[PDB]
Symmetry: C3
Subunit: 289 residues, 3 copies
């Protein structure tokens, strides 16, 4: 059936975490494939395995550790999902996005989503960082949506708008911060398209997606962005272009999960630093003062 989680289920989980840590994060960060190293920048870190937290699902994908880590990143208190969940694991979207609603109940105001994606835009290179300015939700087109079923008014409204999903002011800041880093390669920005997986795309599917206007293709993030927005979380996200998708039948090679080599190795120090500097200020937003 539809969402099997009740409001109290999120309530209980949030209560469990609050009674087990003194940290009160405002920023929540989700780490995609091979981006699990973002965690080792945190100070005063406390790690919780998903399996010990009440209603939490579990990461079954290599590159996804399956741990919730609270810590202080460059002065700001945040919580990180070292590994996320995907629909191709057998998880329904209402299970995949469970942690987004828990964050909301913990008092989190901002959510930054990351992921590894295949490059569709020809100007993208392996190793590029693409700011997600927009997305195309293919599973959504068919009713596969985390918000399907009766609406929980306590989180948001029945018909939430998505045209303004990715925060404009945060994307301005990302660009400004990149300049300060002195990166030779420019900061990319585009549309992220989500499909189910777990197999990689055929040439025809890559050409089709590109013609639809997508810049990168992945198998996650979008459900989370929808639930986040629905409950009023400010959102920002970026894709690490781990590979160039096959656009020709004269296939030199084929995609493979070794793309973690591009993330948790190749572009480790870069985006980890990019995200740390990014914790400069929402500006915070703490009522007054």
């Amino acid at each position: 059936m539809q969402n099997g989680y009740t409001y109290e289920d999120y309530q209980d989980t949030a209560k469990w975490l609050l009674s087990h840590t003194e940290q009160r994060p405002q920023v929540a960060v989700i780490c995609g494939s091979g981006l699990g190293g973002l965690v080792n920048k945190l100070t005063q870190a406390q790690t919780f395995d998903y399996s010990e937290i009440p209603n939490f699902p579990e990461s079954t994908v290599p590159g996804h550790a399956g741990r919730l880590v609270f810590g202080i990143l460059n002065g700001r208190a945040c919580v990180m999902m070292q590994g996320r969940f995907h629909m191709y694991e057998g998880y329904p979207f209402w299970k995949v996005t469970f942690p987004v609603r828990v964050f909301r109940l913990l008092g989190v105001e901002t959510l930054v989503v990351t992921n590894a994606a295949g490059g569709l835009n020809p100007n993208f290179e392996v190793g590029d960082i693409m700011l997600i300015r927009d997305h195309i939700n293919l599973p959504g087109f068919s009713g596969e949506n985390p918000l399907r079923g009766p609406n929980e008014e306590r989180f948001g409204v029945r018909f939430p708008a998505m045209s303004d999903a990715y925060d404009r002011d945060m994307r301005q800041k990302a660009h400004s911060t990149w300049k300060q880093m002195g990166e030779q390669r420019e900061l990319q920005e585009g549309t992220y398209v989500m499909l189910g997986g777990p197999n990689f795309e055929t040439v025809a599917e890559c050409r089709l997606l590109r013609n639809l206007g997508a810049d990168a293709v992945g198998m996650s993030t979008v459900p989370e962005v929808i639930v986040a927005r629905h409950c009023g979380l400010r959102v920002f996200g970026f894709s690490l272009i781990t590979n160039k998708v096959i656009m020709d039948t004269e296939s030199q090679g084929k995609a493979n999960h070794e793309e973690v080599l591009e993330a948790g190795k190749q572009a480790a120090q870069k985006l980890e630093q990019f995200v740390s500097l990014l914790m400069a200020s929402i500006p915070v937003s703490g009522h007054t003062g």
Copy 2:
């Protein structure tokens, strides 16, 4: 699993209605968001709340009253669904389309479907009435179809054609009737595309859908048109363009459910009159005479 309704389930429901009303409608009308006012033109009306009719599902969306109303509209006896069901409510297509098969068993010959839709075609304006000449069924592309599972030969054949879904002669009549109304704004006609919802589309999705050739986007109607056609019901339908979809990232605003303001208020008297005049004649079709 697939369709949980047996032929007898539709039989029973049809029998219940027939033994509770003296009205024998030939035309069935389904009212979409904010079009619930079409009901108050009926004479000798008898209302049934969906909750009292045996195997009937229930409308949970504001703008959808959830009542079956029998009445006489401009001389013709018809039955109206004051509010429909959607997949985003958690309803499977076989539940969403239940009433279409009941209508067939009541003796109904024509079904007119209405709905509120976002305008993709740039020449459309808020308040426009678009005749549905065709549709694109996105959920259908993935197997999400009201006819999935074993086929009930008593209703129709296994592989029904959809290329001739929207009656040609009725669309000629709609245009002729519009002329007689003296409307300054021309009568629109286009392709309706259905997606799951309940969130509104992103700019990228709107551009994608437009490039696919769709004129308006909605979250209903199509499943109903398929089941109707499958059982031999003549079909006609139109969309009330309640809003202009966001096609640019320089987002002035965002879509919201207040679009009922455009329907159940703004274009009330117009389409209600358009539908009343439309009950001129199939010509009826009553064997001979």
Copy 3:
């Protein structure tokens, strides 16, 4: 839930077949709508109704006999599925593709898939044979995939590549063999697109699919190709263009299942001979010698 079949389920079924026949096929052939006649070329044939083989699903579509036939085709020992399964019958993809994994466990190395498809490419004619060089998996875009859920490492890896699904060397051979037949009509080759069904497409959907780059549209094959590739089966496939899809609203007619007339009658002797000659050699591939 996800795949309800365990590795032992495939093991058991493979064992059952092996202890009931002396034939050890290397090639497996799947027959689509109206192509069931490919079976009557086999020598030393042994037929098994799907209903008698342990974990086997059942064909409910006319044109699909529902029998597993072992035999010798032009010198090569093979097994044939006289009739396949489709998602529109109510079958989940993990049920639809069950036989592909059984074949793998029997020792099969090559799988040739066939099907009846509607022509999108304007240069195609009814009766044409199209080599499947690639595919677009619409249900896959939304997570509807035979590999969803935990991965069985004993069959393949979590993220299998699909860009090289259709064997290049076998498609070279198909072209060479066609020349030897002396066919006046050239051998077609293109992209196959899969959608759910069971209804036929609207004009708008046909134009949409064509613009996406598809040459033929069908309601099967793809799930099977994915599971096959995942477990290392060499794959080759072709579509019998049974009809021209409706691309204009000035609809002369509409599609219907009578397309079996084009297959199991019209192009019977041709493709049956084409497939028999095609059993020339992988070259076999039998370790050494």
